[PDB]
Symmetry: D3
Subunit: 105 residues, 6 copies
């Protein structure tokens, strides 16, 4: 660790890393949903649990790893899921903190 790491230019960047990562994921989600707009699926694309849930058809389950941005805070290997039903998307259950073992003391 050096004077470089403690410089205020690096501190400003380091403090924004989680934010930049999440915004980047939100942007990709927006672009994805846009590229699929002509298809009209049963469950349109949504964002929750800081995760993009791509458009889906009835009976599909979308499963993804827990958000990578918080990898260092996870106490177990884990994933999150959402089901597309005839009445829309299910709740994301288990949700992020439960599925992922997120912890910050």
């Amino acid at each position: 660790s050096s004077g470089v790491d403690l410089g205020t230019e690096n501190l400003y960047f380091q403090s924004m890393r989680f934010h930049l990562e999440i915004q980047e994921e939100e942007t990709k989600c927006a672009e994805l949903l846009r590229s699929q707009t002509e298809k009209h699926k049963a469950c349109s694309g949504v964002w929750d649990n800081i995760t993009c849930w791509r458009p889906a058809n009835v009976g599909e389950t979308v499963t993804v790893p827990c958000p990578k941005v918080f990898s260092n805070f996870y106490s177990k290997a884990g994933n999150i899921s959402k089901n597309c039903t005839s009445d829309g998307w299910s709740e994301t259950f288990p949700d992020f903190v439960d599925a992922c073992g997120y912890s910050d003391p």
Copy 2:
């Protein structure tokens, strides 16, 4: 419910902004990668669209901005001509070229 969940409501309200920002970012990167050419008409952003740098007599034609795809009644394109006076106005105008309307 999940559609009306507030995290999704936050995201959905931001989608146009995220999409436009990425398009502007790509435009800035395009103009930057090209800055050692010095063309008649340098790159501009107009009608929510990036217009690559160009020389006199060129016509640049691009598809209508995809961000408003749900409000178009047709797949359209928009153009500008580079002249020795600079860039022309976009033609046809955005609203007509793109078949744009809002209920």
Copy 3:
């Protein structure tokens, strides 16, 4: 007209922010992808530049921030060494490496 229209004028004023933000995003993503490895000099941001994680004895060299190209008199690269004491200061310094001044 178009060149001087306010849509373009707002975009041109945002170019710096858009290009640096994209570079910060890339840096954040790079450091996230390399978090499993535990390198001697970790990823840092300094002089508006991402400096990738590195090992003792490496020198990382990158072009001057393209974002300020119009303010350069020279084709410049900047560098840091990863040493046993950590990251070196940037060399040559940003102003000299890049031939920067405001006009």
Copy 4:
């Protein structure tokens, strides 16, 4: 025309984002000005709403977020209780409390 002008179209599409960002900014400033108190339930942002720090037995009640005023069928409020286990879920739920719907 002027409504459908692309500069206005850019702005209108950004209004929710600008409004939410200012509300988040005010929340961050509120939490920061209060950080030397150490209350049972520290400040949180939930349901697009800032929840001031609070002590056990308190109920914090605020109006529904004004950013979605055009989609409400009534002026509503939302609440949380601070307990010795932390913050409660918002009540009534956002959709019900606020009379929210989209055509």
Copy 5:
């Protein structure tokens, strides 16, 4: 002028000043329009020529100084205007660059 002014932390900020100023004006415009939503005026609030045009009634002319963010590029004292009509807002004419004498060589 010192090493402070030439530091990359200051250069990053200085390069973003116009942007921050315009975004701030856009935010205030958004808040203004929101605070007026119950009123339903003939011409709803709009943004062009990097200017907020507040909600208005038929027959009103809104006039404002040229955007302050570009004060240093103006070659003459000037203002911009927009009229609210029974068929919506007029075009902003003269527009920014004409009204304001904007120049950048």
Copy 6:
């Protein structure tokens, strides 16, 4: 639950960006309002802090950036002098003035 919900978790991660951006915006506005006057030390941004325009012999002192309060061991202020050579370095240095470290 709420404290650990992702809406709050995203907000908490954005706090730094929101607070610094608000401070940068205030700095931009301050410098714009003072542009008629032509001061000896012009407005600058350094060590995540706005340093207002100033005259020879002035010392500008401000509290350590509140944004990093949780990383301070001390109640700190930072200062610069405007001298005939321009702005001084910040004193005491940011790390020492503020009692900063990462935990």
